[PDB]
Amino acid sequence: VENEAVAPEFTNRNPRNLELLSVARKERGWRTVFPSREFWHRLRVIRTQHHVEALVEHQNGKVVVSASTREWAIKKHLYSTRNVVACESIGRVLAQRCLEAGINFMVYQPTPWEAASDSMKRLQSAMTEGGVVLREPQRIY
Amino acid sequence: ELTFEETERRALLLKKWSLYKQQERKMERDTIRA
């Protein structure tokens, strides 16, 4: 049968294949430097003077899924783009975009004061209720 | 204990003093530069 001619070794070219199988490597070094690189996808929050922005970035540095209050589509629905309301709104938008992009797992690396920040707590709560888990599964060795 | 109206008035007072002392520092700086 010609249809059963299958190569002995499969070649999956999806960049997220091993990452989703929880088998791909994470950069496990960098212990003396903050933040750790031992992740596949990272949630990075930039709070500027006027705007609050959130990124979901792969380890390689590619920005995967972004939500910026700079964008009209989001800034046209809230009063101030630099407050807890803005942080929660951008978190919910980013959670929806992550779910639509297939990113269910993420790593968040806040400083102690960022973690203590109520706006960051609200953003994490928004993400977790939107579905994104801010803790990546362990690598399978 | 405190109510909601007094908290709102306190917030408005803080905002108005923000604007007022912002104008104060602005005019002081203008005099300095001039």
Binding site: A7, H58, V63, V65, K76, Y79, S80, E88, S89, R97 | -
Partner: protein, 324 residues
């Protein structure tokens, strides 16, 4: 000896004797931002990257923002940190405004461009929508990078897109079983009249996704091409295999990509059904096999090594007796 630097040494431009008169990093976060900027900046020394690498609209926006700010209820809710945002409206507005750019980012990250057009990119101008009807009451959508089971993708999906002809194509970028570079087409409508899809030319009939068991997660792409004038084109794997690269080379004169929507498929029992019922072949099962652990060349005298050293190199765990 001292070789001079091959470029501007860091912290040399600001190296001045007026240290007391120089403003300092009062905070850790400002230094972090500066350090990230420097890391992004290219350098002449070896770095980690080397090895591991309208006007009316503006006026309307300003007026709308002024109105929203003037609304006292909005200010009260914001100051009480209780306001919310309409997710559906934000989604639609983003799709219209800057959704195509984010979808291009997603496609580049997922490698669709490099694997379909050998790196040639584009922008998905048309906010296409695809959804596989699950049962009768609901329909699982296919966003840019969604996750859909082959059971839900067993039957052809409903496609909606506000536009005016069109050619819609489905490929499995990594489902091939023989040739690594090739891919399988699942269904292709051509010469779509406007929005209605039932009138499309069904050149290749619909195939459900068939990712082999333990073969990982496969990415399936819905491509949509704007069409100027129709052209005549042209359950067997030898005829379902093809390359989007030269396929779109043969039609790029009159076809231009304007829509994308892709999803991830895992194994499911529907894949067994697909492999047996209609592909009429034994389904392949794949396992992720890690390379054998490295051991240094065995020594005659494993000095200071534990007794487990011999086990590290023995192959059979059962007792053997040689000539006896």
């Amino acid at each position: 000896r001292r070789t001079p630097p091959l470029g501007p040494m860091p912290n040399s431009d600001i190296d001045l004797s007026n240290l007391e008169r120089l403003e300092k990093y009062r905070s850790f976060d400002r230094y972090r931002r500066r350090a990230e900027q420097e890391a992004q900046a290219p350098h002449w020394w070896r770095t980690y990257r080397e090895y591991f690498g309208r006007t009316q609209q503006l006026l309307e926006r300003k007026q709308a923002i002024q109105e929203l700010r003037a609304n006292v209820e909005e200010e009260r809710a914001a100051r009480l940190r209780t306001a919310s945002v309409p997710l559906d409206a934000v989604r639609a507005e983003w799709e219209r405004t800057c959704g195509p750019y984010h979808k291009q980012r997603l496609a580049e990250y997922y490698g669709l461009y490099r694997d379909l057009f050998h790196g040639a990119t584009f922008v998905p101008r048309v906010p296409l929508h695809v959804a596989y009807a699950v049962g009768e009451d609901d329909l699982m959508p296919v966003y840019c990078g969604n996750e859909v089971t082959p059971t839900e993708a067993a039957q052809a999906p409903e496609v909606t897109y506000e536009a005016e002809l069109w050619t819609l194509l489905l490929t499995s970028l990594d489902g091939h079983l023989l040739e690594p570079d090739a891919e399988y087409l699942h269904w292709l409508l051509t010469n779509i009249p406007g929005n209605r899809v039932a009138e499309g030319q069904v050149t290749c009939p619909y195939l459900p996704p068939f990712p082999a068991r333990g073969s990982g997660i496969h990415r399936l792409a819905f491509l949509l091409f704007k069409q100027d004038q129709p052209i005549d084109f042209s359950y067997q794997l030898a005829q379902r295999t093809f390359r989007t690269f030269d396929f779109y080379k043969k039609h790029q004169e009159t076809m231009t990509p304007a829509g994308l929507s892709f999803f991830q498929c895992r194994w499911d029992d529907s894949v067994t059904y697909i492999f047996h019922q209609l592909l009429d072949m034994r389904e392949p099962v794949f396992e992720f096999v890690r390379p054998p652990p490295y051991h240094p060349k065995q020594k005659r005298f494993p000095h200071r090594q534990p007794l487990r050293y011999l086990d590290r190199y023995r192959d059979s765990h059962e007792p053997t007796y040689g000539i006896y």
